[PDB]
Amino acid sequence: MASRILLNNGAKMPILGLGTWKSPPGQVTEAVKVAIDVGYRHIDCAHVYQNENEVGVAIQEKLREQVVKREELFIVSKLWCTYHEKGLVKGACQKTLSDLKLDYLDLYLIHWPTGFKPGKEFFPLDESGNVVPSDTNILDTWAAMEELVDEGLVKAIGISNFNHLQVEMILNKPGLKYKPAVNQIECHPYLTQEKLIQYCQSKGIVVTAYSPLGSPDRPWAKPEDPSLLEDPRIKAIAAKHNKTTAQVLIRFPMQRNLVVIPKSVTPERIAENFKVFDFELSSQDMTTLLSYNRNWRVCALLSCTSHKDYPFHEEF
Ligand SMILES: NC(=O)c1ccc[n+]([C@@H]2O[C@H](COP(=O)([O-])OP(=O)(O)OC[C@H]3O[C@@H](n4cnc5c(N)ncnc54)[C@H](OP(=O)(O)O)[C@@H]3O)[C@@H](O)[C@H]2O)c1
Ligand SMILES: Cc1cccc(Nc2cc(Cl)nc(SCC(=O)O)n2)c1C
């Protein structure tokens, strides 16, 4: 198991990163500091997570402490849906760089393929509870992302929550300057993403698996929902390998040549989640975990099911 994966831009992306969605501002600074101390070299961030300033504080402390150099870190952020308009992309990227206190990002992603009306609200809703779209399309937003690479503000650009047709739209864009390096998608034993992973890997696009533990802190969770961390079948695989259920869940995507970004703000769990390079799931273990697929999404963006670019009507 190599600890990094080569991207189509020539850079090496660490296969394990720390997620930061739902990491409250007063906890995330310590979380990122613990993560860097433990050995994480990749942090997944987003403007919409509303904590980039605090992530910035942590990165800067560790750089000043000389625990790491900037070139050893791989920092990802994401363009939020209200900034798809071509003329807003650069400003959004610059606000993120300013919050993170960085001169460049390693990877900047279009967070979702759906553009939302610009303004103060992250999720601008109509009276029916559906998001108000922006008059934007994916290809113009991609061209604005490419300008960030030309200016040196970001080393690589990519996408998140794009279906294969939407990726194909970018790959076939007239005058394409840069291919996406990464597609960041939800992926875990209940949503195994076989077809989309096959597709992406066949195009040289690295896949990053989000919500690998099933996002037990997601705010919309319901008691009837499935729970990976409580699944007795996965606990039995963990018990066999003298590991925790979370560690099994993190190792799983690693053996599929995916990047994985488990989130925690608990120092003991940050450390636990990093101890996944000292064991191997068997061929049978992988086949078994893949069989748990149930097409179940944490993140189904249900307020956008009428949006022209909603990604999840397509099979993959
Ligand atoms: N591109 C996108 O649209 C998108 C969407 C979703 C997620 N993401 C990214 O992917 C990351 C991970 O996904 P996620 O945040 O949804 O969920 P996750 O990483 O699947 O689960 C995080 C939850 O699991 C808990 N946890 C972590 N390690 C654990 C352990 N070893 N034992 C027991 N519980 C543990 C965390 O608790 P504590 O924090 O309290 O320890 C938190 O409640 C996000 O933070 C974000 O960076 C991206
Ligand atoms: C309180 C509130 C109001 C409106 C919408 C949402 N849904 C969110 C919020 C955030 Cl920060 N992230 C997601 S999905 C995670 C992602 O897109 O990375 N969904 C939430 C959590």
Residue numbers in the entry: 0 to 315
Q: Would you copy out the relevant sentences from the publication that reported this structure?
A:
AR catalyzed reduction of glucose to sorbitol is the first step of the polyol pathway through which less than 3% of the glucose flow in healthy human cells. However, under hyperglycemic or pre-diabetes conditions AR is overexpressed and the activity of this enzyme is implicated in the pathogenesis of most of the diabetic complications. Only more recently, in 2006, this same inhibitor was also discovered to target Aldose reductase (hAR)1415 and AKR1B10, the Aldo-keto reductase protein family members. We have determined the crystal structures of WY 14,643 and the hAR•NADP+•WY 14,643 ternary complex.
The ternary complex structure, hAR•NADP+•WY 14,643, contains two protein molecules in the asymmetric unit (molA and molB). The ternary complex structure was refined to 1.65 Å resolution with the final R factor of 16.8%, and Rfree of 19.5%. WY 14,643 binds hAR at the C-terminal opening of the α/β barrel, near the cofactor binding site. The carboxylate moiety of WY 14,643 anchors the inhibitor to hAR through three hydrogen bonds with Tyr48(OH), His110(NE2) and Trp111(NE1). Proximal to the carboxylate, the pyrimidine moiety of the inhibitor makes vdW contacts with the aromatic rings of Trp20, Trp219, and Phe122. Furthest from the carboxylate, the 2,3-xylidino moiety makes limited vdW contact with only one residue, Phe122. Notably, in the ternary hAR complex, the loop from residue 114 to 137 shifts closer to the 2,3-xylidino moiety of the inhibitor in both molA and molB compared to the binary complex crystallized in the same space group. The WY 14,643 inhibitor itself undergoes striking conformational changes upon binding to hAR. However, in the WY 14,643 ternary complex a distinct cluster of water molecules, W352, W392, W484, and W528 are situated around the polar atoms of the inhibitor of molA to form bridging interactions with hAR atoms. Besides results from current binding and structure determination demonstrate that only one molecule of WY 14,643 binds to hAR and its carboxylate moiety occupies in the anion binding pocket under experimental conditions explored.
